[PDB]
């Protein structure tokens, strides 16, 4: 009746600095479906995020896919804060480039 | 193509 | 090969907004090619698929009438079920629906499908005989009841092997290449210290389709998992996917490991080391 968000976060294609590429937040096996999904950059949000149409698995849990463009530096730190019913505090997960 | 109409209530 | 034309629809209630919020999508196989979003500015069926701008607007127009009817339909069925659960201290529900067909490459019905779920657990489901159903609680006994006395299997056994079928072949021939693709995974292995007595190696596979991959590690001919991390395959964004599985060796021998990569559009496995 309640699960918990699997997140992923990621780059469409492997990164390298200085060229442009997608950001991606994969948020799946999740119930309920209310969820608050944001891409930060260095801690502030990323106003011009698209988000994929809700869908859902064989098990019922539902899965949605943030993304947004981006061109990855070696400084620039990015991040996808996740807000959910069964989520106490906003869940924040760093964006590794090998990950 | 979607499913027809629902013809009976839950 | 096999291929599948689903529908995955969620109705969830919202206390004190006035009507639920209502959301249908169309996957072939492992593509999303239509949607529905009551919260849209737009309450209509649109295409979400690059090969589906060639429908004309009657089609549309019947998608949208036949997406409202099921809204309707819902709207309904949430208030009935927090009736036949004596739910009392209201709060959002969420109702979801599944239903399409899987055929076989020979386009045998392999599996038709309709079935629901309440509030995250099954509710009720259309048996495979298409004729039974089956009813996951002693609520959706009295809906099971009804369903049989009213005739609902035959319903929709005429559709789920009917025009379900019909337009699975039909979107299967607009799309074409861009359905029946096979992408090969684009593969390699990094490498990442950890400590003095061991780093990681990691095994990517990426820009794949469709999704069914498998990947596994050896030490010297033989599988390990004795510490592998396995991530969920993912989407790309471009209608690709990605996976990756690393595992934790000891430092000096990461030229003892290999990763094998097992896809659709790789005749042979790929073997690949460090």
New interface residues.
Partial sequence: ???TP?I?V?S???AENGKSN?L?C?V?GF????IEVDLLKNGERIEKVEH?????SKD???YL?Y?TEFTPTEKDEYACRVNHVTLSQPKIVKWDR?? | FYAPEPITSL | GPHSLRY?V?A?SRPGLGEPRF?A?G?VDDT?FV?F?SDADNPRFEP?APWMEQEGPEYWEEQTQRAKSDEQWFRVSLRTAQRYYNQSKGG?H?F?R?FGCDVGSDWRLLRGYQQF?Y????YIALNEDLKTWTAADTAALITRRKWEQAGDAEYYRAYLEGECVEWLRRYLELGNETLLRTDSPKAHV?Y?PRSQVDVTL?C?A?GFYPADITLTWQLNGEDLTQDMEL??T?????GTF?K?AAVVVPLGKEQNYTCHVHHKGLPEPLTLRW
Avoid: C
């Avoid at chain 1, 994929?52 to 859902?56: N, Q, R, T, V």
């Fill in positions: 009746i309640q699960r699997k992923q990621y469409r294609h492997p997608f991606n994969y799946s119930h309920p479906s209310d994929s149409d809700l869908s859902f019922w849990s539902f896919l993304y090998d990950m | 995955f969620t969830v959301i999508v996957y999303q949607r979003d979400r959002s969420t979801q599944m779920a509030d995250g657990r099954d990094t990442h990691r990517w990426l991530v969920e993912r989407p790309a964004g471009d990605q990756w």
